[PDB]
Amino acid sequence: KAIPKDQRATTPYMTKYERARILGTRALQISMNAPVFVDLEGETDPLRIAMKELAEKKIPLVIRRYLPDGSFEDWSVEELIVDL
Template identity: 50%
Template sequence: MSAKQVNVADKTMSYTRYERARIVGARALQISMGAPVLIKDVKSVEPIEVALAELERGLIPITVKRTNKSYRREAESSESSG
């Protein structure tokens, strides 16, 4: 599985495996608690697999904030910017 790459401020960033785990886990919890599924052709009923499919398609509206080496905040959004 390749990491989702997002273009923010002319930089291409990808999620770390920890960010991916956090995003998928949070979304799977939402789905298991009754949140609507964002994809139509669901092949599985398992919340984790549905959340992974949503992440791979870029459908989860989430912003990841991280601190870079110079301690400035960077934002990475899973939504396309154009």
Template identity: 50%
Template sequence: MSSEELTRFEKARIVGARALQLSMGAKPLIEVEGSLDPIDIASLELKKGVIPLGIRK
């Protein structure tokens, strides 16, 4: 594992924080088709690498 890869715990923390932002009214940073759950949107944003959050190791 390289130092740039996120652990599953880091991924869960980032997705959770971003999903909270989305549920409080933040605009999605990806194109969303249909009505998706904020967690699903945050997961897609993480896969595409557009989440404006980071982890300090």
């Protein structure tokens, strides 16, 4: 049922599951010749590339976190802090 960009009580940090699903989702696109958003300083491996995009905060994706009751928060891969 959505929650305003303010009032999100969920973690500002990205969960290890989100990192894995985003990296896997992005890697799949890269593996199907989908446009890339960074400078492949040699990388030719999709996942390895996707990992580079993440580090460079250039993955235009949004994670919709659901709460047990149905409501939900929306964070952008951009926002999410990546420390694991």
